[PDB]
Design a protein around this nucleic acid. Sequence first.
DNA 1: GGGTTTCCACTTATTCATCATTTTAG
DNA 2: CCTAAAATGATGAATAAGTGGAAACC
Length: 294
Amino acid sequence: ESINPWILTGFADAEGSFLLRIRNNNKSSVGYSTELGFQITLHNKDKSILENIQSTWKVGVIANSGDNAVSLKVTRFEDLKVIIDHFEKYPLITQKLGDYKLFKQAFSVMENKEHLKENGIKELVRIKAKLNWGLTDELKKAFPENISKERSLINKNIPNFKWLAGFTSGEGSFYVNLIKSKSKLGVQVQLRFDITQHIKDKNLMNSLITYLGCGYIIEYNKSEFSWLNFRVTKFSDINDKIIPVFQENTLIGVKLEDFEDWCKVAKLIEEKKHLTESGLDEIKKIKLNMNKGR
DNA sequence: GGGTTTCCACTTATTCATCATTTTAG
DNA sequence: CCTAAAATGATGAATAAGTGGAAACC
Ligand SMILES: [Ca+2]
Ligand SMILES: [Ca+2]
Ligand SMILES: [Cl-]
């Protein structure tokens, strides 16, 4: 089941990461060795996702990242041409696009073997200064005259539902909310669909309302950090707008199981079973084995 | 063969995913 | 009164991003 290209790009927009290493080295002529590529680090439970991407691209290496995480790292230079070809045809739409554009400029440098010359390294430092978290303190000290062009902010729209499926497979969450009460059955079942993302992509998060015709944005905070949360709680919207989208565009990873259990609860709610004692017991049993409970 | 590339074990701060009670809407 | 929907209030950790060391390679 080779992963769909757009589903792969949506997943890369969520958990992808481009890397450009500029390491001190005595065994190098210009006194610096480099390493370029793209990586994905997931929990061990979704190692199959990495194995599928590796098999779909016929590129990349897989290794453990601790006792609870796996990573797909592709740094073989000629193998980076598969990455560029994919993202040229199926482009990223988050701020990570700016990181991919720098990753390409770095590829063009190393393809010419300029990274072996001094000016090539000065150019790669130029590019790395705007990539991800920027230059290290050691590099800043080694390149005090470094001057990089301004990095313009990204703003792209959701291309199709395949991308949304891939992005939701990484950032999404399907939740069965058991609103306790001193009522008849004592519990009100409420399905919830959440997508979380940093505020730096507020435009993309805000567009979800019009793209899916439902939901609302909630601003969250934690320490000095903050992020947005696209949420859907109206059952009719969940049953008619959210569920049909991810059934026609299949999710990947373990979250597909949580989505399938999520849909079974929707079927019982649609049939008014959530208002009966036995039906409520089934909703609970389903919730026990979802998400962290699986 | 020696500079360079590639792999592999390993680390870390926070943006994620996931959590649930309380309140309001209809 | 009864049920649905939203608002409120919360945090552990799977992420994104990075690093050390050296075998593989051309
Ligand atoms: Ca992300
Ligand atoms: Ca994820
Ligand atoms: Cl549309």
